[PDB]
Amino acid sequence: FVNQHLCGSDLVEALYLVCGERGXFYTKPT
Amino acid sequence: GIVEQCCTSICSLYQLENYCN
């Protein structure tokens, strides 16, 4: 898994694939 | 904040699970 310093950009990235707020934040909706 | 441990410490998948649950 990923147990390092991911700070926002990454920690929020895992926050997506993880919780995803039941939807999606907004990064690259290609 | 989050980065505090998810940037200065270690961020685990369960720790963020708590960030949203």
Please tell me the total number of residues recorded for chain A in this structure: 30
Instruction: Closest CB to A6: pick one of B7, B20, B21.
Output: B7
Q: Residues near B15 by Cβ (< 8 Å), separated by ≥ 6? A: B5, B6
Taking only Cα atoms into account, the Rg of chain B, rounded to an integer number of angstroms, comes to 8
| Domain hosting residue A5, numbered range | 1-30
In whole angstroms, give the CA distance from residue A24 to residue A12: 11
Q: Which residues contact B17 (CB under 8 A, 6 or more apart)?
A: A18, A19
Choose the closest CB to A19 out of B8, B9, B20. Answer: B20
* Total number of domains constituting chain A: 1
Chain-chain contact of B11 with A5 (C-beta, under 8 angstroms): yes
What single DSSP character describes residue A23? Answer: S
* Closest-CA residue to A27 (of A12, B12, B4, B9): A12
User: Helix or strand or coil: residue A27?
Assistant: coil
Q: What are phi and psi of B16, to 5 degrees?
A: -75, -30
CB B13 within 8 A of CB A18: yes
